[PDB]
Every structure is written in structure tokens, then in C-alpha cells.
Amino acid sequence: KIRPECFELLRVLGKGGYGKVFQVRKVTGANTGKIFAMKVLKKAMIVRNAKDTAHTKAERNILEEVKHPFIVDLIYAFQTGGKLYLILEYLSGGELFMQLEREGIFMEDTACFYLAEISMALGHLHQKGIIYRDLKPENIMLNHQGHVKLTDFGLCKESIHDGTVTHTFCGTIEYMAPEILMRSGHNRAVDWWSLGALMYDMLTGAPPFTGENRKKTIDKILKCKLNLPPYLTQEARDLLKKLLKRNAASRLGAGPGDAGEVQAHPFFRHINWEELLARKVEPPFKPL
Ligand SMILES: C[C@H]1CCc2nc3ccccc3c(C(=O)O[C@@H](C)C(=O)Nc3ccc(S(N)(=O)=O)cc3)c2C1
Ligand SMILES: [Zn+2]
Secondary structure, eight states: OOOGGGEEEEEEEEEOSSEEEEEEEEOSSTTTTOEEEEEEEEHHHHTTOHHHHHHHHHHHHHHHHOOOTTBOOEEEEEEOSSEEEEEEEOOTTOBTHHHHHHHSSOOHHHHHHHHHHHHHHHHHHHHTTOOOOOOSGGGEEEOTTSOEEEOOOSSOOOSSOSSSSOOTTSSOOTTSOHHHHTTSOOOTHHHHHHHHHHHHHHHHSSOTTOOSSHHHHHHHHHHOOOOOOTTSOHHHHHHHHHHSOSSGGGSTTOSTTTHHHHHTSGGGTTOOHHHHHTTOSOOSOOOO
16 A cells, blocks of 8 residues: 655645645655655645546546556555545656757757657547647656656646636647637647647747737637748648648548658658657757
């Protein structure tokens, strides 16, 4: 039986309205000294709300079922009378957000690497019927080697919330597909839109539809009038056009082929998917 006492707390990694994440090491037994991130949620913050409760369960079920290098690993999960615990792998490589800040613009080959790894994560989730929605730089962490890990499948991580009913829009909404902001119904095609907004951000320095404020930004995303700057490679331009389509069903990846359709695009012509998935490819950025 794994218990909170099995872990020594080393620092606070983050906190919000529902709980905290601690860095921990295992105190005794197997992997005595192995470092983890420990997410601790307060049941009382959650159990009163049918939505947040379902959301919580969904997180654990997803992270329990997922077995994939480019998605954050769930090692143990247990609960006490008042708290839910998730022992996760610790991601030392920080945020991809912190990488875009330094670089400003990624070189094509660097963007291509990350977009490729993310696409395999998305393919993994989608064949499981899971829709990410929240693809954005703050959500993409790196492990110690420098590979991608998708995070944030659970309760809202923000300190400032949008409205009093939902947490769907609390983050930046710059990478979110128009049909979600439209509430016109959506499916896995939103992740391929988001992949495009992220790709655009990597290669231009800012997401494709940003305005002076939030309302102006939403208006731009909805209007969806894409201007591709002339310095983008022919391959990136072509992929960006096909990802950032307002009509969901027309997006690359929206087809029955999903991630395979996107991975087959010339923008990824140099990618060896077998060696990428097996983490044999050297990352452009190396934290340690
Ligand atoms: C998920 C782990 C995985 C490894 C990791 N590894 C980290 C390594 C270094 C620094 C932070 C790490 C975090 C981390 O804590 O991420 C932040 C952004 C975070 O999770 N904030 C947060 C979490 C929960 C809540 S809530 N809903 O309880 O109120 C609010 C804010 C992490 C996070
Ligand atoms: Zn929120």
C-alpha cells in the first residue's frame, strides 16, 4: 500500500484552487530516492461539483490508460479521507513555452521535431477516443533528455478564472479551435487546428490570430483569415494552410487517417517515426 508518508517533499512545483504539486523522492523500498512530481488534490474542493468530480476521474482514467513516451506518466494513484494523490513523472526540462521565449522563432528543423513528437501523442490519444483541446506551449513540457510530454488532462491550473460556470476557457485561447469558441460541436479535429496554431507560433514568433485584447483575439480566431508570412518554407506554408482551416472536416488529420494523414505531409519528410517514438532522435534542446 502506497501512502503519502512514502514520499519526502522537496519543493512546491505549483498550486491552484484545487490543490498543489510537490517535487518528492521515495523514502524507502524500490527506487529509494527516485524523484517524482506529486499532485495533491483536496476532495472538498472537488466533491461538491459534479463537473469537477467527473473531470478529476477522467484525468486519472486517461493517465492510467495512456502508455506513451510523449505523454506524462502516472506511476501511482491513491487517496486519503480528504485528498487525492497522483504520483507522476517529474519533468525537469521545463515548458516548451520557456523555449519559444528564448528562441523567439524556432528553426524549421527544431519546430518539425517537436510538432512530430506531439503528433504521435495526439494520435495515441485520438485512437483511444480522447481529445486534447488544450494544446498550447505552457502545456507542453520536456523531460530531462528534452523530449515532449503533454500534460494538463485534469482540473484548471489557472489562478484567474473566466466566468463562474466553466474552466474550458481559463487559459490563453490563442491555440483553441474556432468551433470550440463557437460552441458548435467539435471532435478530434480541434487538436489538428491547435497543432497548426502552435506551429505558426513556433515559426513566426506569435500565434496566428492574436489581438490587443481577448475579445479581439476571439474575433480573429472566429474570422479565421490566415496570413502566411513569405519567409515560411513551401512545406510549412502548405501544412499551415491545411491545419488552420475553419471548416473542421477540411483539416488535415480530420480524415479517417487522423495523425497518419498529418505525419505523411512533406513538412515531416525527414522524420523517422520508428526512431522518433523510440526516442532515438536527438532533441534540439537539452535541459541538462
Ligand atoms: C502535472 C505535473 C507533472 C510534472 C511536473 N513537473 C514540473 C517540473 C518543474 C516545475 C513544475 C512542474 C510541474 C508543475 O507543477 O506544473 C505546473 C504548471 C502545475 O502543475 N500547476 C498546477 C497544478 C495543479 C493545480 S490544481 N488543479 O490542483 O489547483 C494548479 C496548478 C509538473 C506538473
Ligand atoms: Zn479556471
